[PDB]
Design a protein around this nucleic acid. Structure first.
Lengths: 107, 215, 144, 106, 203
RNA sequence: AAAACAUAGGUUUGUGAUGCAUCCAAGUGGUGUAUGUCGCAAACUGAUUUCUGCCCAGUGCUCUGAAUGUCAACGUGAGAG
RNA sequence: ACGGACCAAGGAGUCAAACAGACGCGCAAGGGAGGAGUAUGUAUGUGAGAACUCUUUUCUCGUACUGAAAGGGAGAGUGUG
RNA sequence: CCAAGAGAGUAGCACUGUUUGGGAAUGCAGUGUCAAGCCGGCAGGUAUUUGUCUGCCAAGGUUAAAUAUAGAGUAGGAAG
RNA sequence: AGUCAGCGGCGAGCGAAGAGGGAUUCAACUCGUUGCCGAAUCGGGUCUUAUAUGACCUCGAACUGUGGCACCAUUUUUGU
């Protein structure tokens, strides 16, 4: 939830010879004063934290989804395409090669 | 920044309570939904299994139901109509045992409803099985035939025993206006009906003025 | 998607194409709505004229369903109507039957010139139907 | 009260313009027994009154009463309205004291 | 049912007669310690009608709570703040005195469940409520299948969750839809609802 | 680290307990005060010495002063409401 | 004028509503379901948020606008008399 | 031969505050004040009286299931 | 419906309900004011019975626990 982000760390400010960022609070740790919170810091936030609504999702129009498939179905038998598709069959004959449904029972 | 002429100043997610490195908080995504679907489904089915002798959906009335926008529509509404139930005859308590809803807060606005409903009621009943108990006499309601169903499994949807809708369809008419209607005035004239009410209304002109003009 | 974004095209480049001038840091110089009146006036006035003040009149607790929409105009209907019908009834010796409700609406406002008398079990009409329906020998039945 | 419930309302016959949606077929409502609501369920009265009697009056009641006794009777406009609150109530008190006195007087 | 009398009689608050009754009570409390068990109510009519029905487990308490309002306590009465919630006797106090009262009873022991409570008296100082409290341990009570609901897990208090009708009053419950509204899913819950976020499955 | 403060020494108020002074979320809370004007509280002045003028208009303060200007609720009587 | 001793590894324009354009993309006065729900095996499973969908009810937005309102409201067809 | 047995310093009102998108008041809380012939009571989003008409019948009392889990939850899966 | 509800330096900024579709549900429930009453019909204890029940005290309980009835009824009402 708040990965990185976790010392009671504060920015040290200016006059201190240094870039003016948050730094770790505490001594001895020898994390002591080390840059804090964000992006650029060791173990820190990253820039842009990783959001929950990504649009991992969609609609598709129904006519369209289907329509598309529909083109595809034809092109499932537009043979060159099919061959081209990595499909090979030396066997190749009727495109599609239409088969007994009797096959289906084979156990 | 880029030049593109697009749809002015927008986009939204970069607003309130979207928990940041802060915390907050009002969270309620739907991603659970697959699972949820399943949760509805898996359960639902699984429920059936358990219940199983039972026709599932419980008979309720049919209604025309609300509004203007709904003025013209019917839905099988909540409850029933004790009055109707009465009118078919049936002890409500008992009805509840049969699994036909009851109600009260159906105050029951008009006639039609009974009529329709008794038939609904009846119809279920026609399609009744009712299980008896053995040793005990089938008798009580005259509960019926052990093998007849199959009570179990097809839960049931009550819509089968008594269906939803009802409406009346009107047709072809070579005529009418000729008797009359071509004269029928509706260049306001059949507005008049409203008009009067409006116009004579409370704070409206015909009631106050006229009366005033009179004395 | 990431790859399309300007950013990709715009790295090594400081400003992000914002201008070398204008080292416009990540702040508003403005911020949300307001300030429209001083520093944005011209825009405000211009692009969203009629704002503010409030005037005319109001209807508290209004319940909009109650008004929910009713209107259709003429030729419109026929189209809804079976073409068989619409290529037939014309004469007045067959008035096909139209129930507004399914169409939605409730109110009839003029327009159209049709292509068959028919019956519209219709709920309200403009002036024009007395002059249209009627003129047509087409029909309105108001509901009851 | 039963002055509000009986063979009501053969609504008629068509939408708008003083009549509206459908010539009702006004079902048999309302057998609504909550019209039991007090009435003079005799019990109520009986008790209330005994005790009413038993307790005498209120200061105010008397107070207004005085006003009557003189006849400062637009007065209590205030007392009844303010003291009791609302216009009905006002009315209600008004009867209430008044009556009690008036018959009390005989 | 004698209560019918009792009740009306009981409405006669504003009178001398009562005020005798009141007065004795007003010396009695005024003499008396803060919270006391009772061997019976002093207002049975409400009690029985708020449900008291004569057997063990039913416990009676009379309780004294200072009336008035309150100050916003602040050290030395100083608020920094922007103006708004100011004043020593500023924020007025949302929770009700009864409710606090009950609640204080709720706090007062390590048992009792407010069944309910009613006001009995108030003076210039104290409100008295007579509190119907129940223990949920008597074997008869526990035995009692009518009330035993009282026993259960939700009853690890009640009064501070806001469960009396009165508590429920400040808790706002009215079923009058457009005067029922917001609080109907608590204060909060509905807030959570109402200010939800874009959970849109698809988009 | 003094020409500063403290300081004895100077001067006035406020104030006698159902009080004064005063602390306090609140309580039968606190402290001055386990006490009572040789008292307390409060401020000013700054050994001794010697003196300390004029102004009360201003601005405060004070007043037991006046009494009928004003000054909130508050009441009070007055119209279908 | 500032910053800049050195080398590794870090290290900064994100997700995202309505919305304007652009463009592809669907269908077209309709379109977009849409919430859901059903639904039957591939067989882990299954009677696929995500598989396939599949959809009656439709829902929802869209396919006249104008008036604060009360409210009305478009071939004022064209033409024609 | 008839009965006909429904919640009060509460409701209400003022007042104050607080609170509400709720508007001449959405609540609440305090304080004061403080209701029912029962031709009643409550509601009917512009104050009022005034009258109808429309919907309910409060102020005691209990009640799965469908929901949550939101950051710190615990038994036992499934994952990316 | 971020709406013709609307609040709001009325600005900023805010801002809802009803219905519909829909999920889930055969979900609904008590007391106090009704004649309830031939030694409280109760409960605690005890003791029986293998628990109630039986039984008996206790003594909680006639300041009222039971049962019955609970403004939807009971048939309102009258067929008493």
């Amino acid at each position: 939830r708040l990965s990185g982000m976790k010392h009671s760390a504060e920015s040290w400010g200016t006059g201190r010879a240094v870039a003016r960022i948050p730094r770790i609070h505490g001594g001895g740790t020898s994390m002591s004063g080390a840059g804090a919170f964000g992006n650029m810091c060791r173990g820190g936030r990253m820039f842009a934290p990783t959001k929950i609504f990504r649009r991992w999702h969609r609609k598709i129009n129904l006519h369209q989804k289907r329509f598309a498939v529909v083109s595809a179905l034809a092109a499932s038998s537009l043979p060159a395409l099919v061959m081209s598709r990595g499909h090979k069959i030396e066997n190749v004959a009727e495109v599609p090669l239409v088969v007994e449904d009797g096959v289906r029972a084979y156990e | 920044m880029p030049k593109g002429n697009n749809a002015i100043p927008h986009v939204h997610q970069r607003k309130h309570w979207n928990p940041c490195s802060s915390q907050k908080g009002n969270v309620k995504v739907f991603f659970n939904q697959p699972a949820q679907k399943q949760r509805r489904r898996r359960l639902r089915l699984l429920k059936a299994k358990k219940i199983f002798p039972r026709p599932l959906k419980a008979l309720r009335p049919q209604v025309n139901c609300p509004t203007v926008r709904y003025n013209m529509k019917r839905r099988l509404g909540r409850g029933f109509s004790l009055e109707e139930l009465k009118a078919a005859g049936v002890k409500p308590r008992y009805a509840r045992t049969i699994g036909i809803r009851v109600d009260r807060r159906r105050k029951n606005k008009s006639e039609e409803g009974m009529n329709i409903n008794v038939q609904r009621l009846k119809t279920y009943m026609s399609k009744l099985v009712l299980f008896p108990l053995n040793r005990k006499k089938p008798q009580k309601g005259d509960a019926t035939e052990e093998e007849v169903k199959a009570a179990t499994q097809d839960r049931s949807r009550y819509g089968t025993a008594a269906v939803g809708g009802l409406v009346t369809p009107a047709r072809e008419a070579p005529r009418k206006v000729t008797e009359e209607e071509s004269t029928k005035k509706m260049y306001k004239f059949l507005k008049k009906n409203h008009s009067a009410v409006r116009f004579f209304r409370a704070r409206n002109r015909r009631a106050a003025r006229k009366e005033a003009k009179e004395n | 998607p990431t790859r399309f974004k300007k950013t990709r095209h715009q790295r090594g480049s400081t400003f992000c194409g914002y201008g070398r001038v204008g080292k416009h840091r990540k702040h508003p110089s403005g911020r949300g709505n307001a300030g429209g009146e001083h520093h944005h006036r011209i825009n405000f006035r211009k692009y969203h004229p009629g704002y503010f003040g409030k005037c005319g009149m109001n209807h508290y607790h209004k319940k909009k369903n109650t008004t929910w929409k009713p209107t259709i105009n003429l030729d419109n209907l026929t189209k809804l109507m079976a073409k068989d019908e619409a290529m037939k009834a014309k004469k007045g010796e067959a008035l096909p039957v139209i129930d507004l409700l399914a169409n939605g609406y409730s109110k009839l406002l003029g327009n159209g010139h049709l292509q068959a008398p028919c019956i519209v079990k219709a709920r309200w009409v403009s002036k024009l139907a007395d002059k249209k329906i009627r003129k047509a020998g087409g029909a309105v039945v108001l509901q009851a | 009260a039963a002055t509000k419930r009986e063979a009501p309302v053969p609504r008629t016959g068509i939408i708008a313009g003083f009549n509206k949606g459908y010539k009702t077929t006004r079902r048999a409502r309302r057998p609504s027994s909550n019209d039991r609501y007090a009435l003079p369920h005799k019990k109520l009265r009986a008790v209330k009154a005994i005790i009413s009697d038993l307790v005498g009056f209120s200061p105010m009641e008397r107070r207004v009463q005085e006003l009557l006794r003189v006849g400062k009777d637009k007065r209590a406009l205030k007392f009844c309205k303010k003291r009791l609150g609302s216009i009905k109530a006002a009315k209600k008190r008004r009867a209430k004291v008044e009556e009690a006195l008036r018959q009390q007087t005989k | 049912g004698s209560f019918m009398y009792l009740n009306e009689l009981w409405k006669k608050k504003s009178s001398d007669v009562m005020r005798f009754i009141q007065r004795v009570r007003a010396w009695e409390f005024r003499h008396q310690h803060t919270i006391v068990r009772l061997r019976r109510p002093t207002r049975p009519e409400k009690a029985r009608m708020v449900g008291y029905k004569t057997k063990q487990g039913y416990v009676v308490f009379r309780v004294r709570v200072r009336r008035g309002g309150r100050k916003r306590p602040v050290h030395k009465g100083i608020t920094y703040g922007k103006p708004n919630t100011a004043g020593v006797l500023g924020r007025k106090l949302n929770k009700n005195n009864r409710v606090v009262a009950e609640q204080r009873l709720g706090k007062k022991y390590g048992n009792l469940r407010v069944l309910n409570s009613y006001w009995v008296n108030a003076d210039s100082t104290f409100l008295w409520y007579e509190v119907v409290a129940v223990d949920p341990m008597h074997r008869a009570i526990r035995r009692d299948p009518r009330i035993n609901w009282i026993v259960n897990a939700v009853h690890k208090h009640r009064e501070q969750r806001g469960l009396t009708s009165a508590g429920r009053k400040h808790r706002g419950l009215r079923q009058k839809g457009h005067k029922a509204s917001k609080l109907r899913p608590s204060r909060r819950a509905a807030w959570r609802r109402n200010n939800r976020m874009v959970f849109l499955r698809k988009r």
